[PDB]
Write a protein that binds this ligand. Structure first.
Ligand SMILES: Nc1ncnc2c1ncn2[C@H]1C[C@H](O)[C@@H](COP(=O)(O)OP(=O)(O)OP(=O)(O)O)O1
Ligand SMILES: [Mg+2]
Ligand SMILES: [Mg+2]
Lengths: 321, 538
DNA sequence: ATTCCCCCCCTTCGGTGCTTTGCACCGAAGGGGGGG
């Protein structure tokens, strides 16, 4: 099926990040196997397009798999339990005019030899046109306990007493709860608050304007969803999915499952996989992720724990929540 | 002769056409060198004497090789490179000797006239047309066109590197046990065979390359140690960098100092404890690369310290795959860090340094994490493995930092080492308001037109103060208000601000910054014992 | 005086996003080193 780029859009030119001896060895074994059956073919430097490639060990299988970061290419192309479908995508050939963009470069340990470039001769795995040219599948992931998905309400702590701090914070968990939850226009608290004293009805009327959930906030299929993750401490992760800021389509909490009190990146990587899987079955689009992590930290380690055939777009926040 | 290898198809970018540049004048001896090299390549079939039709031209010139007696012929292909399609480079990095395993047999080879052996695509040969001028500018020149890859064209390196890989693939397919390191045309060949038994397989490679038109003269065939490879000096058991000469120049200019910084930055891979921050600070503000820069007493000491480090010999060792990598980081002052990588203690694989200040406000923990990430990426590049770190940060300090930080951070398997300079958080903002301590409600609000702010504090127990600020902004004035609150409080204060900006600068627990005000706030925060900080909406 | 290509570091300037029209961060382009 003739596939083409977005008019005015050329093709991916992404560099290849370094890999580990064990990933390279798996990639060489896999690519040699595929090249001998015609799925891929060697190319030269006359092809100026490149996409990053990396290998992942699938869950409870001990068998390596090849993953190509077809994120730049997919954004430029003009076109419940889960299991694999990419395998079958190897049975429909590509278009000779399009094969030039699906090119990767396997690196070498200690830069021993120039990288070995390949290109696809059939439908790749991770390319949005792939499902197309070819119950719900995302693009290669063909679709856990989706019987309990809801929106965590915001709640001011319930106990007793009131500190010029508990109220000085209260007007904070409140005045911020405005573009999000309207109705709490309470303004009388500025009487036991702005007053200068040591930090050492409205309440329930808003504890009710908070009881009510993510009112309205309906989804439009024009703007891609945005997901922002917050680290609450000690393996506690909370996320918010909003199309336009200050109106949440869905919010949730991710507690400590993996990387017990030692690995933040393992927890963050699995949370991203969890939220993305949630979105696909209900919205169908991978949200853009605002990740509470540095640039170098995420790029180095996210491949070590990744277990999903799809890769969503993401940005990294730089300011406190 | 010329490689029977298949030519790589090359095209110009669509709409674009070939060059039509002229030839610049040349020195009378460069003309002779150019015409002799050119009579040679024409006899060998590397250029095809063109003539009365070619509407293309490109300037040519010559330099002197490292041989100091031969000339290299170059073509200024800048306009053609602009008009030529884009190529994807296959050279992803430079091989390092620290990633080389000890091999009993080692030999280094060099392919003579490496580029002039790989053919150039027939349709692209017209665009490479050039004119060799006239001896003593008199007669019309003898013009030629390139039948092979030219030196100066931007598609030549990638094409040559792919062609060499395609040539060497048959040899590596039938001979797995020899390691082959190909950098352009420089070949490092290692084997687990004896001398009299791997020469037989080296003379086999020398004939396999010669079958594809790739010659290998025996004046750049190194058969005995020490081998000069990739700017190093490979010994049978160790390796080192080739001798490094540092300037002894009385008056230093900007370029005269950037050369010094470049030399030390390259010597820092093996030599330990190399610092350039005091010298690299002399390269700020100044932009004219000819003015005599006076050497500050801080940079003079760094030059004095660096030159005695380069006075004693340093040599690394080779990788042993049946071992674990150990990296030992050390804090050496002013945000500069030094690390050493080894498998056996006191025998370094390679040394390094880290002095990059990433961000406006940062502390030692974040800098150490950045250094750890850099070392991890570099080690994965060289050895394909993640090393084990000997960090000077306590386990409890790292636990405190990472359990109370919004940003997710991690460090791979590591252990703590007792070195005098340790990584610590100099202060900690507390969670609950302190009894017995007064409050310092701060506001510094400015005027965006006259640049006039009002920085002050108000206390619950009847104490207020206000200081007019000029030439300041909204954020600078409230930072100054926080500083004023810290200045006149006892050894315990409760600071409540209206600033989500000043909290971020302070909640992250920095210890140094370029901003003087933030440094003064940090300095005063260290003196205070227990501090609480919270934001309110006005 | 005149070229290309790769890796690294160090400094400077423009673009971006949020916000409090400053401020902080990042990417690309100079200088240098090394390599062929
Ligand atoms: N200064 C340079 N400018 C452009 N290309 C260069 C330069 N130095 C080296 N190269 C490229 C082109 C060369 O063919 C290739 C290999 O370098 P080198 O071996 O020194 O040259 P060579 O093979 O032409 O000469 P030699 O006969 O001395 O080996 O690298
Ligand atoms: Mg050489
Ligand atoms: Mg040579």
């Amino acid at each position: 099926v003739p596939v083409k780029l977005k008019p005015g859009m050329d093709g991916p030119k992404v560099k290849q990040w370094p890999l580990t001896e064990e990933k390279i060895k798996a990639l060489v074994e896999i690519c040699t196997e595929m090249e001998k059956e015609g799925k891929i073919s060697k190319i030269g430097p006359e092809n100026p397009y490149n996409t990053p490639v990396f290998a992942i060990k699938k869950k409870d299988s001990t068998k390596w798999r090849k993953l190509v970061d077809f994120r730049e290419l997919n954004k430029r192309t003009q076109d419940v339990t889960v299991l694999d479908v990419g395998d079958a995508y190897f049975s429909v050939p590509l278009d000779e005019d399009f094969r030039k963009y699906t090119a990767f470069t396997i690196p070498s340990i200690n830069n021993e030899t120039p990288g070995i470039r390949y290109q696809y001769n059939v439908l790749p795995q991770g390319w949005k046109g792939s499902p197309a040219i070819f119950i719900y599948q995302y693009m290669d992931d063909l679709y856990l306990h989706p019987d309990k998905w809801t929106v965590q309400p915001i709640v001011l702590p319930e106990k007793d007493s009131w500190t010029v701090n508990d109220i000085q914070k209260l007007v904070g968990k409140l005045n911020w709860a405005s573009q999000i939850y309207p109705g709490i226009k309470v303004r009388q608290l500025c009487k036991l608050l702005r007053g200068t004293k040591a930090l050492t009805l409205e309440l329930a009327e808003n504890r009710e304007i908070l009881k009510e959930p993510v009112h309205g906030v309906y989804y439009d299929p024009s703007k891609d969803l945005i997901a922002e993750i917050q680290k609450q401490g000690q393996g506690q992760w909370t996320y918010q999915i909003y199309q336009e800021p200050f109106k949440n389509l869905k919010t949730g909490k991710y507690a400590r499952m993996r990387g017990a009190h030692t690995n933040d990146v393992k927890q963050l990587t699995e949370a991203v996989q969890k939220i993305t899987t949630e979105s696909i079955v209900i919205w169908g689009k991978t949200p853009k992720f605002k990740l509470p992590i540095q640039k170098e930290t995420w790029e180095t380690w996210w491949t070590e724990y990744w277990q999903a055939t799809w890769i969503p777009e993401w940005e990294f926040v730089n300011t406190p929540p | 002769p010329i490689s029977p290898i298949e030519t790589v198809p090359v095209k110009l970018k669509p709409g674009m056409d070939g060059p039509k540049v002229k030839q610049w004048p040349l020195t009378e001896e460069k003309i002779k060198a150019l015409v002799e090299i050119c009579t040679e390549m024409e006899k060998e079939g590397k250029i095809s004497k063109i003539g009365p039709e070619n509407p293309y031209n490109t300037p040519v010139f010559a330099i002197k090789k490292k041989d100091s007696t031969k000339w290299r012929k170059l073509v200024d292909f800048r306009e053609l490179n602009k008009r030529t399609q884009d190529f994807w480079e296959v050279q992803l990095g430079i091989p390092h000797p620290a990633g080389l395993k000890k091999k009993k047999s080692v030999t280094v080879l060099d392919v003579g006239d490496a580029y002039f052996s790989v053919p150039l695509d027939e349709d692209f040969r017209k665009y490479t047309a050039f004119t060799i001028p006239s001896i003593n500018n008199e007669t019309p020149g003898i013009r030629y066109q390139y039948n092979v890859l030219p030196q100066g064209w931007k598609g030549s390196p990638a094409i040559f590197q792919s062609s060499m890989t395609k040539i060497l693939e048959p040899f590596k397919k039938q001979n797995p046990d020899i390691v082959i390191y190909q950098y352009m045309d420089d070949l490092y060949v290692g084997s687990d065979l004896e001398i009299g038994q791997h020469r037989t397989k080296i003379e086999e490679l020398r004939q396999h390359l010669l079958r594809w038109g790739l010659t290998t003269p025996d004046k750049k065939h190194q058969k005995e140690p020490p081998f000069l490879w990739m700017g190093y000096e490979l010994h049978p058991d160790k390796w080192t960098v080739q001798p490094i000469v540092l300037p002894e120049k009385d008056s230093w200019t900007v370029n005269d100092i950037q050369k010094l910084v470049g030399k030390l930055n390259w010597a820092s891979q093996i030599y330990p404890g190399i610092k350039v921050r005091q010298l690299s600070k002399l390269l700020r503000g100044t932009k004219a690369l000819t003015e005599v820069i006076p050497l500050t007493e801080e940079a003079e000491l760094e030059l004095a310290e660096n030159r005695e480090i380069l006075k004693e010999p340093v040599h690394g060792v080779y990788y042993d795959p049946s071992k674990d990598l150990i990296a030992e980081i050390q804090k050496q002052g002013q945000g500069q860090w030094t690390y050493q990588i080894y498998q056996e203690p006191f025998k370094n694989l390679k040394t390094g340094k880290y002095a990059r200040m990433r961000g406006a406000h940062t502390n030692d923990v974040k800098q150490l994490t950045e250094a750890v990430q850099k070392i991890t990426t570099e080690s994965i590049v060289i050895w394909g493995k993640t090393p084990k770190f000997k960090l000077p940060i306590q386990k409890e300090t790292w636990e405190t930092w990472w359990t109370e930080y919004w940003q997710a951070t991690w460090i791979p398997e590591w252990e703590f080492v007792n070195t005098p300079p340790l990584v610590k958080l100099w202060y900690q903002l507390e969670k609950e308001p302190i009894v017995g301590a007064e409050t310092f409600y701060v506001d510094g609000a400015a005027n965006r037109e006259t640049k006039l702010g009002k920085a002050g504090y108000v206390t619950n127990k009847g104490r207020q103060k206000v200081v007019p600020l000029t030439n300041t902004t909204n954020q600078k004035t409230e930072l100054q208000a926080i500083y004023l609150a810290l200045q006149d409080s006892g050894l315990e204060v409760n600071i409540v601000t209206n600033s989500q900006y000043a909290l971020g600068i302070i909640q992250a627990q920095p210890d140094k910054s370029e901003s003087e005000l933030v440094n003064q706030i940090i300095e005063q925060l260290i003196k205070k014992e227990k501090v609480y900080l919270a934001w309110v909406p006005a």
